[PDB]
From a paper:
Introduction of a ring nitrogen at position 3 led to 1,4-dihydropyrimidinones, which were especially potent against HNE. For example, up to a concentration of 50 μm, amide 23 elicited no observable inhibition toward CYP 2C9 and CYP 3A4. Due to its overall balanced profile with respect to polarity and potency, [name]-678 (20) was selected for in-depth in vitro and in vivo characterization as a chemical probe candidate for HNE (see below). To confirm the exceptionally high potency of [name]-678 (20) and [name] 85-8501 (29), we measured enzyme reaction velocities with different substrate concentrations at various inhibitor concentrations and extrapolated the inhibition constants (Ki) from Dixon plots. Both compounds revealed (substrate) competitive inhibition, further confirming their binding into the active site of the enzyme. Beneficially, [name]-678 and [name] 85-8501 revealed no inhibition against 21 related serine proteases, up to an inhibitor concentration of 30 μm. In our complete series of co-crystallization structures we observed an induced-fit binding mode. All bound inhibitors from the dihydropyrimidinone series were characterized by rotational dihedral angles of the northern cyanophenyl moiety of ∼90°–135° with a preference of dihedral angles of ∼110° (mean: 111.6°).
Numbering used by the authors: 16 to 36, 38 to 63, 63A, 63B, 63C, 64 to 90, 92 to 146, 150 to 166, ...
């Protein structure tokens, strides 16, 4: 996140760090004790057997006993199309179930098909780059839903009056709007925090029947 701020430790207990040999590479969201969801592009060229799913994290540079660590048992995809930047979503089934507590919680999702209007206020978040290295402390950022320079196949957001946005490493992280996970961070244009192109997220509301079919 560029131009954001530190989150309060464990403010967003559904927030997940996907890691390889102890290094964060993508965010994800806990959607049931045994399932996370992320961006399809996070795992496209990654061997998932090596992925560690880290729950209950805040500061990635510190040893944290609030953490729970899982491996990926199964992947569910939904037609990820990198040529057209579409369906940038994957569900990772864990090799066991999270222990739900103060530091690890299941996120609430929107109704199937729910659109967000121009001007909706959301929080983006993640451990991605802080300037246009990766964040130690989880960052969050106030963003505004926009339709200009967006397609109906994304939820896009823009910070006005300054350059701020998601960045590399924020891939797969949730966008929270009106208390529900409405987005998964998908792509930028014009580099991070251009102040021109809105950030694009996979529109989670469009995938809700699909999600529900998998997680129960
Ligand atoms: C392949 C890849 O690694 C890509 C990355 C990280 N990003 C990217 C860069 C910075 C931030 C983000 C974020 F939005 F956070 F997901 C994504 C692209 O903008 N472009 C790439 C990209 C990402 C997603 C999709 C889709 N659909 N197509 C291309
Ligand atoms: C589920 O997985 C946990 C973490 O597994 C570790 O990371 C993965 C990516 C592999 O490299 C693996 O060799 C590591 O052990 C385990 O600690 C935990 O026991 C597992 N839970 C089960 C099997 O119920
Ligand atoms: C900045 O955002 C703060 C938190 O956002 C609210 O709660 C999150 C989890 C989402 O549900 C989001 O849709 C909500 O807006 C707000 O408390 C604060 O008002 C925001 N400030 C401005 C100026 O946008
Ligand atoms: C989750 C959160 O922090 N939401 C706050 C809300 O409680 C408050 O009424 C408003 C004030 O502007 O900002 C937003």
């Amino acid at each position: 996140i560029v131009g954001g701020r530190r989150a309060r430790p464990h403010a967003w207990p559904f927030m997940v760090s996907l890691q390889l040999r102890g290094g964060h590479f993508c965010g994800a969201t806990l959607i049931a004790p045994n399932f996370v969801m992320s961006a399809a592009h996070c795992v496209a060229n990654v061997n998932v057997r090596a992925v560690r799913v880290v729950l209950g994290a805040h500061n990635l540079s510190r040893r944290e006993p609030t953490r729970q660590v899982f491996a990926v048992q199964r992947i569910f995809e939904n037609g990820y199309d990198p040529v057209n930047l579409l369906n940038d979503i994957v569900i990772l089934q864990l090799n066991g179930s999270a222990t739900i507590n103060a530091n690890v919680q299941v996120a609430q999702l929107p109704a199937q098909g729910r659109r967000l209007g121009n001007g909706v206020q959301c929080l983006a978040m993640g451990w991605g780059l802080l300037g246009r290295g990766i964040a130690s402390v989880l960052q969050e950022l106030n963003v505004t839903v926009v339709t200009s320079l967006c397609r109906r196949s994304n939820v896009c957001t823009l910070v006005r009056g300054r350059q701020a946005g998601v960045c590399f490493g924020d891939s797969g992280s949730p966008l929270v709007c009106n208390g529900l996970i409405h987005g998964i961070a998908s792509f930028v244009r014009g580099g991070c925090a251009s102040g021109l192109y809105p950030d694009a997220f996979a529109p989670v509301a469009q995938f809700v029947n699909w999600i529900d079919s998998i997680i129960q």
